[PDB]
Design a protein around this ligand. Structure first.
Ligand code: FES
Ligand code: FES
Ligand code: FES
Ligand SMILES: [Fe+3]
Ligand SMILES: [Fe+3]
Ligand SMILES: [Fe+3]
Lengths: 321, 325, 311
């Protein structure tokens, strides 16, 4: 609503396809807009994403029911077809509903088992995820995490690597290996790419090789390679509004399928360790570079500074300060 | 208080008389103003309705006591008489209190077992309720319902009749039978009147005839509604009264009267409760929370909305800007 | 931070010294600023009081860990020494931390068993409390009371004497005439003359600390009432109480104070508006002769230029 056109015109994940099943009604919130998500009882029916608002008298359509490939609002029973047009008004069953009688519909695309939404007119496509079609990679999904922090602070914390030995001790690092190597960062028209850097953990030694790339500011493609196992993930942040976010991960890996529950637990521990910091930080919104006291930057922050720099040019004013 | 003068100079119910016993101290809220209502320990004492504020040091007078026909603020024990004029300060008991030690008082009338209050000069009368004095009619009162919606939304839902087959399915209709007949709506000198309209009720007792309900209602005031319901062998009338707490919050009460057997009173209360709670579910979710008058897309109107539309037009005529958008 | 300079440059109690143990990290809130209060593990190490803020990425340092005379940010492990200078950045262990890597520190002193804080520059000293040096007097501390009231309303209720017979009936008065009162506002601050209740008087050298004296037919009890201004609309109340009667009456003294206190708090929580009205709920305050001390306090605050927590 008060978000910049550059965010309104991008794709974001609002749900996993698994939490929307045939006949269901679910709700989401994206950039200050309340959304209703529904499908027909039909197997493989498409997913509609609309503003959660019946235009007759302002009741949430989410409180309605799916019946006969239509969503029926629960106040006066108007029925809206899959295109959002009202097709039956029960008070006047032979009146053709006025043209006005139409739900606000949004672009929706199902990809990687994720439900993607764009509130405006999409200028880019949904980010790539090459491993999706690779049969030697297994896949899994975290649950969704509600976070009381800017979406841009969520991504800022995910781009920050020097904190691993301190809040992620025992999984991504340890206090006896806290020094950070030179980090190569490039911001270009592709997006922000951080070059391969090395993580101490639990083939030369107890370390891993990681890189990541952001084609868009709220979706991150990460890669980590162990001795004989590669894991990749798509991290994707729902910007609920300027101060609140949903975090989800799609995770694929080419090692044993027995690692799934271990990966799920590792992510849950790391995410919760991050949330404790994120909820604590002030200000709530992500501070941008100088064009309480101003944020200080040392060399291991060069990727975080590049992110703030990239947001400034991108003209992001929403959820930042 | 940002309430329009139209609203300020009208009467509203803030309590049931039977809940304000002699010697009692009650609180309420009306149009953004906090109120204290207190009575003398004497039988048949009048009710005083004042702003709940001691102007000495800003404590609520409702936290004090009633004694010797005065309200006493507990902080320093200043004593306020029926007219609000403080008559004694215990720290200087032979001194005459300053003339500014005066409670802000309001107009109060008891009518139909209800406490009516006007925070400004009461232009209008309390609405009529002709069957009050008719001894063929028994009386009962619902509980009060605190509702997180604008008072004008609460009343607009009350005027809406096309929602009966959906959120009142099982008692005021069914989805299958949902067509609405065209309605007659008048907005004259008498306020807003909806003419007689048939209501298809849902079958409960199969030994009995279909009820075949006929209703009409009038609003002389925008937050008080008089409804008349002719049944199979029973007339029921009700005065529906909406207290405007502020622009976004309301209290709903009904005074119900009927000329059938007095044994139905539990029946009637339970049936009103079930339909009120289904309306409150809808009212609590509606957006925007203030009532739109004639971000979010504007409201749509179809012919079934004739009554509602007339209500919104009436509110603009009256100049209502409080609780509306 | 939006607080007036005259308030910035005075001392306030934020804690009891016994709650600041070696190695500990605690928090407080003062004039809208959030504070961290910690000590090294060395016996007789001093108390540091900083703004609870890591300047790197805005994390509360009070979520950190005290190590080797340093406070360690939990997020990237930066270590701050007892002067609040960042001594170590673990990602660059061979690098001199830059000058801006520096905690905002404040003045702190211990006195009367309390932790006193000045967020600005200390011109006056911590108020006097003569009986502290008098070993004929035993001492005791109430618990702290968090109050949803302006600190100046809290103190105003403490300088109103006419309400004793009404909300404190049974301990402090009985239902009520008030004697002519003596109030003296000069350099010494605000002083109220000896008055019978039992004979009481009190002094405020500063606007949020009060020294009160009560003499009974057998003993003298004094107390230092020190209110913490958390913000414009919130206060912490504490009392240090000293008496020269038997040491066995500590229980009952503390029960009496707790009893009257909660009685005062019932009133304070209900008062409107929240902030104390100075002399200039919709209607204006009215004053009668027994308000002479509370009138003097409002006058004193406006001559001082207090705008925070008032009207
Ligand atoms: S509000 Fe949706 S049908 Fe009337
Ligand atoms: S505040 Fe009511 S008598 Fe003092
Ligand atoms: S936030 Fe404190 S060290 Fe980075
Ligand atoms: Fe992390
Ligand atoms: Fe209804
Ligand atoms: Fe008191």
């Amino acid at each position: 609503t008060t978000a910049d056109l550059i965010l309104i015109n991008n794709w974001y994940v609002v749900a996993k396809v698994e939490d929307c099943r045939p006949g269901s009604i679910t709700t989401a919130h994206l950039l200050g807009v309340k959304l209703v998500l529904w499908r027909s009882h039909e197997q493989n029916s498409p997913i509609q994403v609309w503003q959660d608002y019946c235009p007759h008298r302002g009741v949430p359509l989410s409180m309605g029911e799916v019946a006969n490939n239509t969503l029926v609002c629960p106040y006066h029973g108007w029925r809206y077809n899959q295109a959002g047009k009202c097709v039956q008004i029960p008070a006047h069953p032979d009146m053709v509903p006025p043209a006005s009688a139409q739900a606000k519909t949004y672009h929706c695309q199902e990809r990687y088992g994720l439900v993607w939404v764009c509130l405006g007119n999409p200028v880019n496509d949904i980010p790539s995820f090459p491993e999706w079609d690779d049969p030697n990679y297994h896949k899994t999904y975290t649950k969704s995490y509600l976070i009381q922090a800017s979406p841009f602070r969520v991504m800022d914390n995910s781009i920050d690597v020097s904190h691993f030995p301190f809040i992620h001790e025992g999984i991504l690092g340890d206090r006896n290996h806290a020094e950070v190597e030179d980090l190569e960062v490039k911001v270009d028209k592709d997006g922000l790419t951080m070059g391969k850097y090395q993580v101490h953990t639990s083939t030369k030694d107890d370390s891993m090789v990681n890189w990541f790339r952001l084609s868009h500011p709220l979706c991150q493609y990460c890669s980590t390679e162990a001795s004989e196992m590669r894991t990749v993930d798509l991290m994707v942040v729902t910007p609920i509004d300027e101060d609140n976010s949903v975090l989800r991960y799609l995770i694929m890996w080419n090692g044993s399928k027995t690692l799934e529950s271990k990966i799920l637990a590792d992510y849950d521990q790391v995410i919760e360790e991050d949330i404790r910091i994120l909820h604590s930080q002030q200000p709530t919104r992500l501070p941008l570079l100088s064009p309480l006291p101003q944020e200080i930057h040392v060399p291991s922050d060069r990727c975080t500074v590049a992110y703030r720099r990239w947001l400034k040019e991108l003209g992001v004013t929403y959820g930042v300060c």
